[PDB]
Design a protein around this nucleic acid. Structure first.
Lengths: 104, 343, 235, 342
DNA sequence: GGAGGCCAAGATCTCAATTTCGTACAAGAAATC
DNA sequence: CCCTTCGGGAGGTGCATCCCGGTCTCGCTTGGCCTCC
């Protein structure tokens, strides 16, 4: 209904964007709210310079380091820039089969 | 020579439906979708454009006048040229690419072809898709089931002679036996349709040919029914349609519209308002729509467009506001220099 | 003059990449990005300011900016696509409102689009459509990231005109070993012949822009190089 | 001299489609995809660049106006120089190859040839592609069927005179029988394409020419139709477009920019907003777009973007924002020393 | 009589077929207009 | 101030169509011929 009612807003204010467009805009806004909230969650981890936190993200949808085209790639921004190297080198609980594909 | 943008809404009076071969599949009848299975269905701009093109063709036929019996001077080739842009004679003047002012003479003397174009001639009129407003607003209408008339009311059975009553008996027994056999064959076919998913391309091939010959077996079983080829009693598959009262945002453009061509377009909208039917399933009165368009022109080089007027089509009439639209309609109506006849 | 780190930049290729014989070097992309960022086309000043964001090998005369190497994922691979630029002489283009055609008896001489200097040029170029484009370079991550994200630079031929090899989602990951100039003696970008690095012989300037300056003999990598994206993100 | 990056979104008002020979195949009309069918389509930057070059050419034509005789001052040579940068009469300044910043006089006198280059003079406008933001923002739009008008509306038969009603009957007969004949020939053709897969190369020297002679027989049969060369009851193939209301990320740039060139570009955008159409299938109103471009420039020396304004093209109007963009437009409107002829 | 323009002719050929699906919550403070 | 009731029995079958009809092009030069300067 936020998408529908916002579409009503844009329709009556004269802006021409279809309802699915407003759905997409609302989805992106919510996903950015999710990114901010998860950034807050990870910020709970480290508060003092001596803090050591083992963050376990058990969601399957958190983008893998190798999956740069993953749908929720923006969630990779949750990890602070400084700790992105350990994000790249991170232990995967349930990874997805890779191979040695000769066409490398 | 103005670029008229008709921006407006098509409210739906009776369900709006269309069967487009691409969208519909064996899963059922589905409306043309806005890019994906889980997408908002849209009424094709193709159907609206064709309906408006036939409305404009009828406008031109009535304007050119009807002879004593009622026949238009246009031949069949001209009617096809005007309504579908197809030249059956092949005499239609193909405009070799690079020809300056390609069809400017034809556009001047044929407003309808100028609007709706031809092969090798750009149609000034662009009729966009009608996208819905708000979630939902589409549903599976139609549906139901054809029913044996005599098994619903016995009073229609007093009108049949004994031989016809036994004919109905034979028809029903044949339908029952054919249904049982075809249902067994379709259960085997459905086992194959499950077996598809192990689609080793060779086994996919052989399985598909097996489904093909099962289909031929079904057709042969139905061909050996003396009385009725088709099962009389059968559920009607529902068709997806935009609900009654659905608001569908619609945008149309006439690029470089002369007053004559835009007058013809507005007259086509006026005549379409008499039978404002879009799409199919017209047996269920599907397609009736009331649509209101705001006509805005945009002088190139100016930051804002100016609203010439408004066209509202409702069951109570066609309301045209703005003197500009009236002047355009009158300019189209008062020009005698349209040789709609093929050269 | 600033502290420069080995970085590997991986970006999502959005349009096919057209390679002008020699693989596009990241230094050329950065030279174009700087030419846009400092509004001056002089090669000298743009080069002078490129050294401040890229390491420059003085004894070798080349920038520490590896050539293009396609990152191929198990789902999408290096593909052969054609970058097609086609003249569209529309009826509106072919109209008296825009020009005065030479007239003969009130008929306008149609433009001979079939052949001749006024034809519909259908120029087809080979293009490579890989899911990812990768470069390696020894430089400041901040400046190169800003340039690649916001400067209107793509990978390949004439990104301005044809819009070839446009990229987004530029990701920079620091490397452990400098893999910009050399890797197990295999040249990873245009390097001079005398450097002792082996590869493919060619003629091109060592420093960008690669279309001005004497074309001296160089050794350059295979124009189309492919690596698994997992192997590239391993570091 | 400032590099103006127009970073912005194109929201699609009616489906946005483009026909590219490589992308389109026999399997159907598909958008350029940069990979397999599962890849993400992009609207070419070439189409947008050509459309905006056409818009700029029209702006130049209007600013120049018409001669006293009511004819554009541009001849075919000048028209093709401004429109597609091809020198037809071989009379153009062949700038030496190794000076990058060459043609400053032509760039000053001709801002259209400056923004969009000619052959031998690098253009200043790099118009990037409209990349979709989402995953399901394309679709097989169009599609339908060219229905025989008289088999849908019976009332249209009351207009046909009998000497044309029998002509219609003959046309339908010929269409039907020619179409079953073409169907049989196509069935033989696809059976032969199945047989190609068991190729031993003894037959293949014959099979492909056999296929070609079957296509020739198809063309002969189509020619045999006396009353209509092409079947009218055609199922229209769908074309792949970007969905209505698709948010496509668009990056455009002008390189180092005299106020006049940037003003000409902004005027071209203002004239394109009159008919904001990208791509073809204009019969279905395809291409109608509204786009908001944030005009950023680079700080002198520093590597940071400063936002100079916004270009919001919408059906309701063009909202040029930022005093500097207005200054560029005013500079282009003034400085009437431009000599677009040659 | 020379100079533009429209139109027909010229050798065989090189290649590949996706099969739809997002996202599923909590509470910070309060003289609110 | 009392005190809010147990239960009972939840279908049987039909029938799921037939059919169309899937385009032109064009990316080059060249002279022969046909009209104009």
């Amino acid at each position: 209904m936020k998408a529908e009612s916002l579409y009503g807003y844009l329709k009556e204010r004269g802006y021409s964007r279809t309802f699915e467009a407003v759905n997409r805009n609302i989805y992106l806004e919510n996903l950015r709210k999710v990114i901010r909230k998860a950034k807050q969650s990870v910020g709970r981890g480290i508060r003092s310079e001596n803090d050591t936190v083992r963050i376990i993200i058990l969601d399957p949808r958190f983008p893998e380091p190798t999956d740069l085209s993953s749908k929720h790639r923006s969630l990779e921004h949750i990890i602070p820039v400084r700790f992105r190297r350990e994000y790249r080198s991170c232990e995967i609980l349930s990874p997805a089969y890779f191979e040695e594909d000769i066409q490398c | 020579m103005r670029t008229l943008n008709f921006n407006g809404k098509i409210s739906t009076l009776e369900p709006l439906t269309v069967t487009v071969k691409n969208a519909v599949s064996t899963s059922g009848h589905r409306l043309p979708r806005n890019g994906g299975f889980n997408a908002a269905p849209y009424f094709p701009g193709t159907s609206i454009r064709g309906t408006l093109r036939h409305a404009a063709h009828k406008v031109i036929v009535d304007r050119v006048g009807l002879n004593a019996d009622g026949k238009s001077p246009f031949d069949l080739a001209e009617h096809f040229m005007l309504a579908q842009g197809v030249d059956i004679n092949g005499e239609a003047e193909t405009f070799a690419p690079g020809e300056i002012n390609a069809g400017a003479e034809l556009r001047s003397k044929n407003p309808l072809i100028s609007l709706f174009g031809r092969w090798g001639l750009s149609g000034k009129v662009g009729i966009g898709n009608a996208i819905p407003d708000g979630d939902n607003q589409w549903g599976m209408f139609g549906g139901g089931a054809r029913s044996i008339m005599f098994q619903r009311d016995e009073s229609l059975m007093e009108f049949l002679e004994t031989d016809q009553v036994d004919r109905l008996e034979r028809l029903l027994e044949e339908q029952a036996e054919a249904s049982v056999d075809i249902s067994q064959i379709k259960t085997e076919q459905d086992a194959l349709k499950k077996a598809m998913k192990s689609a080793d391309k060779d086994t996919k091939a052989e399985l598909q040919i097996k489904v093909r010959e099962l289909d031929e077996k079904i057709q042969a079983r139905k061909d050996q029914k003396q009385e009725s080829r088709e099962s009389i009693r059968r559920p009607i598959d529902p068709y997806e349609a935009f609900i009654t009262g659905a608001e569908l945002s619609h945008r149309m453009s006439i690029k470089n519209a002369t007053d004559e061509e835009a007058g013809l377009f507005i007259s086509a909208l006026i005549r379409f308002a008499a039978e404002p039917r879009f799409g199919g399933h017209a047996n269920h009165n599907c397609g009736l729509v009331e649509a209101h368009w705001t006509v805005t022109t945009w002088k190139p080089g100016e930051l804002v467009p100016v609203t010439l007027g408004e066209i509202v089509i409702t069951p109570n009439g066609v309301e045209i506001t703005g003197d500009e639209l009236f002047a355009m309609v009158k300019a189209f109506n008062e020009n005698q220099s349209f040789d709609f006849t093929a050269r | 003059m600033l502290n420069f780190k080995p970085y590997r930049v991986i970006m999502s290729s959005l349009t096919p990449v057209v390679i002008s014989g020699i693989a596009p070097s990241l230094d050329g992309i950065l030279y174009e990005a700087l030419s846009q960022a400092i509004p001056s086309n002089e090669p000298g000043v743009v080069l002078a300011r490129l050294k401040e964001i890229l390491l420059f090998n003085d004894e070798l005369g080349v920038f520490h900016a590896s050539s293009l190497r396609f990152g191929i994922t198990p789902e999408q691979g290096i593909g052969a696509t054609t970058s097609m630029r086609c003249d569209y002489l529309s009826p509106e283009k072919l109209s008296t409102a825009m020009f005065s055609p030479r007239t003969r008896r009130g008929l306008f001489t149609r433009v001979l689009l079939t052949g001749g200097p006024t034809k519909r040029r259908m120029t087809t170029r080979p293009a490579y459509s890989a899911p990812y484009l990768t470069f390696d370079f020894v430089g400041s991550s901040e400046a190169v990231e800003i340039l690649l994200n916001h400067a209107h630079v793509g990978v390949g031929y004439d990104y301005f005109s044809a819009a070839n090899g446009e990229f987004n989602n530029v990701t920079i990951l620091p490397l452990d070993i400098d893999t910009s100039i050399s890797n197990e003696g295999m040249a990873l970008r245009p390097v001079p012949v005398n450097s002792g690095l082996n590869g493919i012989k060619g003629v091109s300037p060592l420093i960008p822009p690669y279309f001005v300056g004497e074309k001296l003999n160089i050794v350059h990598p295979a124009p189309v190089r492919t690596q698994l994206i997992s192997s590239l993100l391993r570091g």
